[PDB]
Amino acid sequence: SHMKERAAIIESMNIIGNVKASIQNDINNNLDISQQTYDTPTGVTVTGSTSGATIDINLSQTSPQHFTNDNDIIRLSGVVVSGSTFQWTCSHNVNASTLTASNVPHTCSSTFSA
């Protein structure tokens, strides 16, 4: 089922594109992300600080037709530093999840443990 799972994760990034944009705009207006309120879809958690931001997608909530395990979380981590333009990195949870290098898109093969 690794293919349908990947497809669903690729599609899930559309759920958060405007959240990413909102966060970037807020950083560009020198706001602390932790102090803002974001318009986001269900199953999504936003955290951050003055120095970055994290968006978690709980796939069992966003995409229940493909994922049922509550640890199946994709994380987008956003940051700007002097040396490079604001950039997002995608990672997947490996703590008792179903998410592996095989069933996540190649852009998300980085790992974390929730």
Side-chain angles (χ1 to χ4, degrees):
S1 53
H2 73 289
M3 293 191 79
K4 290 183 176 157
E5 287 155 10
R6 175 169 299 130
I9 294 168
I10 289 166
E11 176 59 39
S12 78
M13 301 304 177
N14 296 121
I15 292 172
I16 64 164
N18 53 313
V19 183
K20 291 170 70 184
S22 189
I23 289 166
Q24 297 164 190
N25 295 344
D26 288 357
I27 291 308
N28 292 337
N29 285 315
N30 298 103
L31 305 185
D32 185 337
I33 301 311
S34 70
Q35 303 304 300
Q36 312 311 139
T37 298
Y38 291 93
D39 195 346
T40 83
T42 58
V44 174
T45 315
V46 179
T47 53
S49 66
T50 53
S51 57
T54 305
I55 307 169
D56 282 355
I57 299 173
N58 188 313
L59 295 164
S60 74
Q61 297 164 347
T62 63
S63 313
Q65 304 170 107
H66 302 282
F67 301 90
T68 61
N69 185 325
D70 295 327
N71 294 336
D72 287 356
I73 301 161
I74 291 286
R75 173 167 292 171
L76 271 289
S77 302
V79 192
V80 61
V81 293
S82 59
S84 85
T85 203
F86 193 106
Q87 266 130 359
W88 296 92
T89 301
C90 186
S91 57
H92 69 273
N93 190 19
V94 299
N95 188 14
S97 79
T98 75
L99 303 185
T100 68
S102 166
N103 70 344
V104 307
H106 62 92
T107 50
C108 297
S109 38
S110 301
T111 62
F112 72 99
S113 190

